[PDB]
Design a protein around this ligand. Sequence first.
Ligand SMILES: CC(=O)N[C@H]1[C@@H](OP(=O)(O)OP(=O)(O)OC[C@H]2O[C@@H](n3ccc(=O)[nH]c3=O)[C@H](O)[C@@H]2O)O[C@H](CO)[C@@H](O)[C@@H]1O[C@H](C)C(=O)O
Ligand SMILES: CC(=O)N[C@H]1[C@@H](OP(=O)(O)OP(=O)(O)OC[C@H]2O[C@@H](n3ccc(=O)[nH]c3=O)[C@H](O)[C@@H]2O)O[C@H](CO)[C@@H](O)[C@@H]1O[C@H](C)C(=O)O
Ligand SMILES: NC(=O)c1ccc[n+]([C@@H]2O[C@H](COP(=O)([O-])OP(=O)(O)OC[C@H]3O[C@@H](n4cnc5c(N)ncnc54)[C@H](O)[C@@H]3O)[C@@H](O)[C@H]2O)c1
Ligand SMILES: NC(=O)c1ccc[n+]([C@@H]2O[C@H](COP(=O)([O-])OP(=O)(O)OC[C@H]3O[C@@H](n4cnc5c(N)ncnc54)[C@H](O)[C@@H]3O)[C@@H](O)[C@H]2O)c1
Ligand SMILES: [Zn+2]
Ligand SMILES: [Zn+2]
Lengths: 310, 310
Amino acid sequence: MKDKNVVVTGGLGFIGSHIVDALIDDNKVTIIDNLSSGKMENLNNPNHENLTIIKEDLMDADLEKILKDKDYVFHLAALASVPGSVAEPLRYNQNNIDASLKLFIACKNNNIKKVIFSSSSAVYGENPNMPLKESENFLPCSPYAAQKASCELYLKSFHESYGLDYVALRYFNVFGPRQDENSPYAAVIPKFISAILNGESPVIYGDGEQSRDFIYVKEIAKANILSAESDYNGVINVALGKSMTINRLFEIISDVLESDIDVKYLDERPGDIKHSLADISNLDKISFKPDEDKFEEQLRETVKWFISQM
Amino acid sequence: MKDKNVVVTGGLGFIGSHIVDALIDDNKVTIIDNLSSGKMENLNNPNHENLTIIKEDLMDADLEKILKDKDYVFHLAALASVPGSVAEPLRYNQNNIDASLKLFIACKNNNIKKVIFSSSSAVYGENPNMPLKESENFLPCSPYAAQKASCELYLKSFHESYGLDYVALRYFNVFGPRQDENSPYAAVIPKFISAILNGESPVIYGDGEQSRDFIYVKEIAKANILSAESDYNGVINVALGKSMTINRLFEIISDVLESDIDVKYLDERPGDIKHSLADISNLDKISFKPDEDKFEEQLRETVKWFISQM
Ligand SMILES: CC(=O)N[C@H]1[C@@H](OP(=O)(O)OP(=O)(O)OC[C@H]2O[C@@H](n3ccc(=O)[nH]c3=O)[C@H](O)[C@@H]2O)O[C@H](CO)[C@@H](O)[C@@H]1O[C@H](C)C(=O)O
Ligand SMILES: CC(=O)N[C@H]1[C@@H](OP(=O)(O)OP(=O)(O)OC[C@H]2O[C@@H](n3ccc(=O)[nH]c3=O)[C@H](O)[C@@H]2O)O[C@H](CO)[C@@H](O)[C@@H]1O[C@H](C)C(=O)O
Ligand SMILES: NC(=O)c1ccc[n+]([C@@H]2O[C@H](COP(=O)([O-])OP(=O)(O)OC[C@H]3O[C@@H](n4cnc5c(N)ncnc54)[C@H](O)[C@@H]3O)[C@@H](O)[C@H]2O)c1
Ligand SMILES: NC(=O)c1ccc[n+]([C@@H]2O[C@H](COP(=O)([O-])OP(=O)(O)OC[C@H]3O[C@@H](n4cnc5c(N)ncnc54)[C@H](O)[C@@H]3O)[C@@H](O)[C@H]2O)c1
Ligand SMILES: [Zn+2]
Ligand SMILES: [Zn+2]
């Protein structure tokens, strides 16, 4: 992508910062981010000539004005937490549905060429029909999952009502540089890496045979950019279509870190589904083929990032 | 249902007033209604000893307090318009998602035994797989349809997260006494009846071969009450599972009114789907069998109501 003027909501966050990095040399980029979880220092160059940063909540921003003469909108801003949403459903509704809708209204009023929306495999709930096809019904188990599904439904309705073109991307388990490790809720790869680097035993919730479809953050960024350039409108899973158990993950991370620190086993967390696996056939719709044998290399890059932060 | 204390949101409206009528002799009923479209005079007895009316927007009401010690909540309050939602998606979002969520939060915090939610066959969009089963995916064509679907998804998530029991009822084409005829958007049965009573030719948008699954408002009220009493949680179509063309409807209404006024034919309305038909198998889940040969009787009751309003 070259010579476009794009908006990246949540562009100071984990995933959004990697999208900004990939676009910024050849495109004007306006980030809208309230710093609720993102950081200026997540950007490779936060002073880049092509960059604009608007430090504001989407609910307050004049999105009708900001989106004038923009080409594409990448919507990553969200309160991105399943357990957080259970504790605070109304606040999550404001950030995840209401703000998204305000953005989508400004998109259609400004004739934005495409919206690329960050959804989640959480919308599937506990579905045994793996590998999970996009045609599965929604089975949201948390307010967060209902919110992402609601946004997908609004996008469908905006396509029909106003001709707004969009891709909704259902991410599976994203990992990589700049992912949070500090929250009680933080993802397993950051927790395993952080624990080992701090000389502490990590923990597994359950027996460790649970499995996930992990996908590297730079691949998510590529999928976003390819979706913007595609003529396809609709919903696409973004993953590798491969399973890894948490036991196996721990072995691999321990090998990468040359670590003899052992893992502890605790009871299962309520709400954790046992197995999650994407069907990624529809990645053909955006001409995306993720790298299928680069997990160790990606983990090494992630570890090096966490080392640099100590 | 006897000796319960219930809340009916939108209880001064078309459908809600019939639910209030059916419950009020044997139960305490609190209506919450902002009079945006409902009327005091829709109730059979607006001064009934068991009645309380709170004239307030759901967004402003202290629902946490109002729902203390209530048994059931019937949620009918909404901005109930497909074309209105296209014109004003944010305002419709506030009334249809945000207010519903505030209510559902108060329901789960007060351990309400059941929520009975008014959804719509609009959530199916233009789906040729008739008769339409509840398992069909959502295909919302308007912000309204997305909003009703979002509410259904929130209810599912609240069942999983908090144990809130619910039934979402997908109404097909409701008709009967107290339905609005004055809006530009008003439903076909009121428009046909009102036109003929005013000595004016009604209009058909298209060729009249379009068909709908019409369902009488008193049957909707019964389905609501049976759903409250049922152990079932989930989503159920409420209809007859029968089709009637708009041409045939006009013939029947003209016969009932002994009218020689002819109908005019105009171009199709954008957004109108041609055929809509419910699969009503899952009405067995709430032990409801609607009357299958009472259409003329129901139309006569509707006509007599419109006559009484002249
Ligand atoms: C925090 C995070 O990134 N979570 C994301 C991740 O969930 P989840 O699959 O629950 O991710 P995990 O917590 O990393 O759990 C994955 C597995 O790892 C075990 N585990 C986790 C932590 C630990 O210390 N020990 C341990 O054993 C755990 O029991 C589970 O089996 O993937 C989902 C998509 O597939 C996202 O919806 C979800 O939220 C994102 C933000 C969003 O939607 O915006
Ligand atoms: C106003 C109203 O009650 N509309 C409801 C009705 O829609 P619709 O099926 O569009 O209902 P119609 O407008 O009565 O249209 C039905 C058919 O009749 C023709 N027609 C309509 C008017 C007229 O003058 N002449 C004429 O020919 C028209 O072209 C169509 O084929 O049924 C749906 C459920 O099946 C509801 O979602 C919808 O909104 C409710 C509020 C809600 O969800 O809350
Ligand atoms: N990390 C994952 O595994 C994962 C999986 C599935 C979906 N997602 C989705 O991808 C997107 C990005 O997630 P992430 O992991 O980068 O999360 P993140 O918290 O790092 O990024 C979200 C960014 O949005 C900003 N933000 C939040 N609310 C805002 C508001 N109201 N106005 C303006 N800015 C706001 C935050 O400050 C942050 O920089 C989210 O929509 C998330 O739900 C992530
Ligand atoms: N009429 C139909 O054919 C049909 C079909 C499918 C679904 N529904 C649904 O059934 C329910 C009732 O529809 P109806 O036809 O009786 O509509 P209606 O407009 O007659 O009733 C809605 C009632 O809610 C009140 N209201 C609206 N917004 C409110 C708010 N924010 N706070 C408090 N009160 C509010 C109105 O004053 C009105 O009395 C709605 O949820 C509607 O979407 C109706
Ligand atoms: Zn297993
Ligand atoms: Zn036909």
